[PDB]
Structure 1
Amino acid sequence: VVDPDIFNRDPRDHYDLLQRLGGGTYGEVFKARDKVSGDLVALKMVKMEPDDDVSTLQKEILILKTCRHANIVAYHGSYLWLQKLWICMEFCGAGSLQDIYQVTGSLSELQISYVCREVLQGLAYLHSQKKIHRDIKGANILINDAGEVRLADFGISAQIGAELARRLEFIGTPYWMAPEVAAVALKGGYNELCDIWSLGITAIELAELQPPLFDVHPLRVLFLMTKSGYQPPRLKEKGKWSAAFHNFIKVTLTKSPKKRPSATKMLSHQLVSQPGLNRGLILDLLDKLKN
């Protein structure tokens, strides 16, 4: 049972499917139009084979449904019909920042500052609800035709939450277990501040078109991050970026999560609290797509 409010009907009763936009972590997303209002929506479709654990999709719907914040893609309901789950969400007409920068080239510092502010607002909200995105990157930060910014793809978040509940269910007998083994079963071994690091990396991505170590094998990156006194990455070109931008990167990429600032503390940072950050900056970026 995927959701108590699920619509047991064909979403094509309400929506005209327009085109496949591609896929996130899992499933496939369609652009669609409400047949009554004419409003555009995104419809994420996920197959449901007979012997499938529903807990991941359960958790994703639950996350989306209980968010009401402008910087998180709005949720409109879900459908189950002919073994396909459809999650109905806000549509963002310009796609991801990755889709955009792959045409336009690197974002300006002000554009990056605006994006980071809007993401931080989204993250502050999520973290206030004890939710963790866990997949903050350019591909999951969507832009609408108004230049507004939305966090999308809670697939990783949902998988993690499903795994945690499964680990708790099947923890087994604890009497011989070391406390650190018990602790990670119960708590998962990291917290929401992982999203702040990911935003710092995203800020570099938007500036340079790639995250740090993009050319290094992903398993090898995991080894290097855990090895030694691992040094947090930095922006490549010192002279291109302000002291405030360099500082934003330093502070977001604090190695120790005990010392890494919260989303709320980061919203007070000079880079993101400055005047003149608004959707107009992204409207200028979207103009580059035509000109």
Structure 2
Amino acid sequence: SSHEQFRAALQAVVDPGDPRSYLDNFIKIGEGSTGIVCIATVRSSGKLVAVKKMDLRKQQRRELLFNEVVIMRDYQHENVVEMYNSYLVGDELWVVMEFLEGGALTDIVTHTRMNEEQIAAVCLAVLQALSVLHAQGVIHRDIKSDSILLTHDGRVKLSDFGFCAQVSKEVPRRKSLVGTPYWMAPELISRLPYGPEVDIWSLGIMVIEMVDGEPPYFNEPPLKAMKMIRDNLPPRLKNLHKVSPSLKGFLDRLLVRDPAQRATAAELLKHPFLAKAGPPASIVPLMRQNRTR
């Protein structure tokens, strides 16, 4: 079986052993495209951790599972979720990671209206993460609100590296059709070889999420939305009239069709819009446990 074969491959790269030995009270708190996320209690300490559980038989491209252990081993950073250990548990890859108790940005953009101080704080944090990743040739390829997690005290971290890839002198561009339709860069939908620029486009779409509450063409079925992204001019905010000229100027550097003219993360870190960025505390009131209080 290719399955048994693949299990054996994964064992070669993961930690030995079984975290069920030291964790209690697995409770499911969400699901991505590649698996589920449980919170667990470390028995000895009462500390909470997050465990991502990805079934080897339920992946579109099961070789992408290796990306989790590449990021874990190599590209840890303060705006990236800490990954502690990886294990093969039966037919699943388990990744034990930091619990980001503030939850995902998705809940906030769904239920709340972020102001520009808050939007700037998120964008700055993501851009710091991306400048460091991109400098190392790492492309995330699934930037969207669901991929952004928050600490209780409002610090922002990138998560969901399942679809990441590496470029280098010897492999300067990627070609794979990877991401989430509504957030995919037009050059990527067009099947042009691409680089880290695609992440900057996806971030632009996330800015639209944060302003409009959904990405462009979210009402269209995905295959149809990709067609639209590929063919049309850059998407426009439903609520253009609600954003500062500073934010519009910023967004216009992100949603550039031509990847060669799109701003890089490192350039975007100096943009005046990010001077508006609030401290982590500024994000805390948006979280489900605070907004009702």
TM-score band w.r.t. shorter chain: 0.7 to 0.9
Task: Let me know the Cα RMSD of the aligned residues.
Answer: 2.8
2:24 pairs with 1:16? yes
Q: State the alpha-carbon separation in 2 of the partners of residues 71 and 140 from structure 1.
A: 12
215, 221, 224: which one aligns with 2:219: 215
1:179 alignment counterpart: none
Is contact 1:14–1:36 with CA below 8 Å preserved after alignment? yes
Q: Larger Rg: 1 or 2?
A: 1
2:249 pairs with 1:247? yes
Equivalent residue of 2:10, what SS?
coil
Q: C-alpha deviations, 1:133-161, integer Å up to 9, x for none? A: 1111111111121101111111222699x
Is contact 2:105–2:149 with CA below 8 Å preserved after alignment? yes
Unaligned segments of structure 1, at least 5 residues? 169-183
1:279 alignment counterpart: 280
Q: State the alpha-carbon separation in 2 of the partners of residues 40 and 201 from structure 1.
A: 32
Q: C-alpha deviations, 1:150-182, integer Å up to 9, x for none? A: 11111222699xxx9xx99xxxxxxxxxxxxxx
Alignment of 1:146-157 (within 5 A): 146-157=153-164
Between the aligned residues of both structures, percent identity stands at 35
**How far did 1:246 drift?**
0.5
Structure 2 CA distance for partners of 1:81 and 1:237, relative to 1, 3 Å: closer
**How far did 1:17 drift?**
3.5
2:144 alignment counterpart: 137
68, 85, 90: which one aligns with 1:77: 85
2:55 alignment counterpart: 47
Alignment of 1:95-174 (within 5 A): 95-103=103-111, 105-157=112-164
Q: State the alpha-carbon separation in 1 of the partners of residues 28 and 245 from structure 2.
A: 42
Query: Which amino acid counterpart does residue 229 of structure 2 have in structure 1?
Result: M
**How far did 1:241 drift?**
1.4
**How far did 1:48 drift?**
3.4
2:229 alignment counterpart: 225
255, 258, 277: which one aligns with 1:256: 258
Structure 2 CA distance for partners of 1:54 and 1:206, relative to 1, 3 Å: closer
Q: State the alpha-carbon separation in 2 of the partners of residues 53 and 107 from structure 1.
A: 35
22, 28, 36: which one aligns with 2:44: 36
Unaligned segments of structure 2, at least 5 residues? 1-8, 176-187
Q: How many residues align?
A: 264
Is contact 1:20–1:31 with CA below 8 Å preserved after alignment? yes
TM-score, normalised by the number of residues in structure 1? 0.82
**How far did 1:235 drift?**
2.2
Q: State the alpha-carbon separation in 2 of the partners of residues 29 and 66 from structure 1.
A: 22
Is contact 2:82–2:97 with CA below 8 Å preserved after alignment? yes
Is contact 1:94–1:100 with CA below 8 Å preserved after alignment? no
